[PDB]
Write a protein that binds this ligand. Structure first.
Ligand SMILES: Nc1ncnc2c1ncn2[C@@H]1O[C@H](COP(=O)(O)OP(=O)(O)OP(=O)(O)O)[C@@H](O)[C@H]1O
Ligand SMILES: Nc1ncnc2c1ncn2[C@@H]1O[C@H](COP(=O)(O)OP(=O)(O)OP(=O)(O)O)[C@@H](O)[C@H]1O
Ligand SMILES: Nc1ncnc2c1ncn2[C@@H]1O[C@H](COP(=O)(O)OP(=O)(O)OP(=O)(O)O)[C@@H](O)[C@H]1O
Ligand SMILES: Nc1ncnc2c1ncn2[C@@H]1O[C@H](COP(=O)(O)OP(=O)(O)OP(=O)(O)O)[C@@H](O)[C@H]1O
Ligand SMILES: Nc1ncnc2c1ncn2[C@@H]1O[C@H](COP(=O)(O)OP(=O)(O)OP(=O)(O)O)[C@@H](O)[C@H]1O
Ligand SMILES: Nc1ncnc2c1ncn2[C@@H]1O[C@H](COP(=O)(O)OP(=O)(O)OP(=O)(O)O)[C@@H](O)[C@H]1O
Ligand SMILES: [Mg+2]
Ligand SMILES: [Mg+2]
Ligand SMILES: [Mg+2]
Ligand SMILES: [Mg+2]
Ligand SMILES: [Mg+2]
Ligand SMILES: [Mg+2]
Lengths: 157, 157, 157, 157, 157, 157
């Protein structure tokens, strides 16, 4: 009974994230996407909206579910009986930042972290940059799930 | 039925490698350590010796086996019914190098790659540096499995 | 007929920037320095001040002009019938950041980005650090053009 | 008589910091730990609390003294008749940031900077991450000096 | 009349290279692709074979020419009345290596270097890795120009 | 009583190295430049030549001496009753490499390593690249001390 948690703010989920979800879901029996609620940033979408967007985009993944999360990620992981985190990485800078978190998380709770390399086609997409470009009129429709994109257009208009 | 391959030259296997093996074996139903034979470098230990050293060091891991490998790693992986590779990373430089390989391997064969961060205590150990230091008389006994260390002393004397 | 846009906040312009301008102006028929303004973030110098400081220190570059703008850089570029951005880089971290921006800008508008390595002498110079150092009385006279240094000291007092 | 300044917010001091202090005190005739006060960012501990926590953790270092500092670091260093800064580095991006600061500090005041590599065991610890983890109930006792940990428990209640 | 040299071994040219060539030819009045000959390392293709493969792949670039080159690159550039090199970059370590070469080339001869970021789709391709993969039966047809791929099959038999 | 060892192959010594020597000599009571020789790899200059070139360019540093050695650097250090190594760093890549070496050297012998940032002017300078450039006739006169430049040209002819 293997399993992994995929955390993020996902504000909104991108095709880069979806690619990671698909790859995690192909290698672990159970995947939980953890939408991390931060009260020190509302962001663009509500936690409810983010969850909904991810659920819509992951319907073809039978072994994946989506839940909101607060507090220590390692507590989220262990309270669900798991002890692995899966995250995507774009750059060596990402790796150095996530290395520190991964080692801390292993130290405090025995939770391991597995990283995957970004899909080449989505190397430059981040939720933040997608929102920024879209805000000023750039076409990001090829970078986001179809559902998300329409919802993003809504938030701007 | 999940599974992953852990490749390397392992000449010899270190405690850094063993840590990765243990972590892979804890998260996948089946782990295969692939000792990659290169004819353009005999190295210090024979493929047979490397395999033996890994088997000795991994006896407490029931779901791990060790095999030699040649040619395309993705062929090794797919011919055994798997499509995941697990490798440890120490630095952002490691990540950039392995990112390219991971993306190539996904492109040519659909095989994914999962990375784990090195254990902090073994951040500086590599097979090559361990051999170099030992060759000049430095004590690397805390960096290698007990079995390996004695075998290394043998190869030097 | 060839041309490029050199963007930045230039608050204020430094000798590192001027080196980039000179090198761009030597290689393309026209160069536009784009002073990009955040209408929600004032910065130290006004737009007219930033432009004046750049003009005064680029008087010997006949094919360079200075204009301000806001919003998407690729719109500024394309509205002038150009298709190239030129930016200096100091570090691998700069490169990772700017590579993602460049790939996004090419994706959304087909605009290309050319990078140039910092002059060794100015590799540690940034507008932000120069302002910070000067705020606490450090001597940054050799890092800024004459058109800038005393105006900066004036702002701070 | 050789000497160096070890600057930081140290809010609170960690075992990573202490390792740097010990190694600096072993190599320089005198070390001054400079606890840097920032008026706009009151941390978790007051400057006096931070100084006392460092003094307790460095009781066996007779050539190391602890003082509060404000303003331009190279002024602090020169006002005490010294000309060197010592800082620990964990990652390549630590180095890129500190290299530019070191080159700037050498340019503006002739003060040099010596770096040491983190101890492997503490490569992932930072004051900020330790505080964050502790705030949400994580056990960071193995990452901080005994005394600090007791005080940290106190501030969380 | 603006111009730049695009140097490499191009053994063989890849779609990553071609993307750089196209973008350079779009921005400079002339581009010379310099196929660098190294007497001690005969690659897979002869210099003449490499030149013909590039000519076939760049047939639609009328301002781009292909020549063989030997010796100091900045001599090659200056002998053709040019003063700029253009190269593609994939990763931060590509940048660190090329930054030092670019600074050296500017110091010794006044020749500048412009970099472009890789196309996302080809970020992982290199001539060396494509050859290695192909040698062991991997399909690299989507990574190389049509013609190159046919010739590559030929050299493997 | 304080002291440090500055190691390298110094084949030949460059202005980047001399900058590091000067800074080390300003901060510790004694500095030993350790010319480390590979008895299986001749290099361009003999040991006596390397030492002579360093002595001639460090005559104004009364507390610096030059000695050759081989094998483990930590043995060279400890045999002189010292416990510190000082090395310059140019890039994050240098840092990742040297951090692993420093941690290994501390592990096996308790010897510490202090790093210093390259002078901006010499950030792109290395013995290897200087030799390569000079081999093909590039002007490296401003990158090497007078004690080195013409001797290098002599070797090449
Ligand atoms: N294109 C991509 N491919 C793979 N992984 C990615 C990609 N883009 C982002 N990620 C990773 O997915 C994780 C979730 O990203 P998310 O946008 O949810 O949060 P974030 O990166 O922390 O951004 P923010 O700081 O705005 O919350 C992050 O670790 C991020 O590095
Ligand atoms: N301490 C460590 N922790 C985690 N992973 C490590 C550690 N040391 C090495 N590795 C990784 O394990 C993998 C196997 O290493 P191995 O020594 O077998 O081959 P290698 O790194 O390619 O060395 P060589 O080039 O000598 O073959 C490599 O990808 C390496 O980066
Ligand atoms: N010393 C330097 N040499 C070469 N290029 C530089 C140097 N310093 C900055 N640059 C380049 O100049 C560009 C514009 O710099 P500018 O300070 O205007 O903006 P910025 O770096 O985005 O800073 P801020 O965040 O303060 O607005 C930067 O993106 C960087 O690419
Ligand atoms: N584990 C560690 N090992 C070695 N050096 C470290 C470690 N953690 C931090 N440092 C160094 O100590 C210095 C001071 O750390 P401190 O927490 O005081 O400040 P900081 O990192 O700037 O944090 P903040 O931005 O939260 O004030 C940092 O610049 C860093 O170089
Ligand atoms: N996919 C890519 N995208 C952009 N630029 C690339 C790509 N692949 C290679 N390059 C650039 O093209 C240049 C020439 O590549 P080439 O294969 O000719 O030489 P190389 O990388 O030095 O290989 P080798 O060392 O095998 O000769 C490289 O310096 C690199 O900057
Ligand atoms: N420009 C520079 N500024 C500061 N330090 C430098 C510079 N160039 C080299 N160094 C440092 O000097 C040390 C000794 O350099 P040296 O050329 O003797 O050996 P190396 O870098 O190991 O080269 P090689 O592999 O050619 O023997 C290097 O390890 C590096 O730390
Ligand atoms: Mg992101
Ligand atoms: Mg290794
Ligand atoms: Mg800047
Ligand atoms: Mg910190
Ligand atoms: Mg290449
Ligand atoms: Mg070097």
């Amino acid at each position: 009974m293997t399993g992994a948690v995929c955390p993020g703010s996902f504000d909104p989920v991108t095709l880069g994230h979806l690619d990671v979800f698909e790859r995690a879901a192909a290698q672990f029996d159970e995947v939980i996407v953890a939408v991390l609620i931060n009260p020190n940033k509302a962001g663009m979408f509500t936690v409810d909206e983010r969850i909904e967007m991810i659920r819509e985009s992951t319907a073809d993944l039978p072994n994946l579910r989506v839940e909101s999360g607060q507090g220590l990620l390692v507590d989220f992981v262990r309270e669900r009986g798991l002890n692995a985190i899966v995250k995507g990485l774009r750059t060596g800078t990402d790796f150095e930042y996530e290395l520190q978190m991964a080692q801390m998380n292993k130290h405090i709770a025995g939770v391991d972290t597995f990283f995957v390399a970004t899909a080449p086609a989505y190397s430059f997409v981040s939720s933040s940059l997608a929102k920024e470009v879209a805000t000023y009129g750039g076409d990001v429709s090829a970078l986001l799930p179809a559902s998300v994109h329409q919802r993003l257009l809504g938030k701007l208009r």
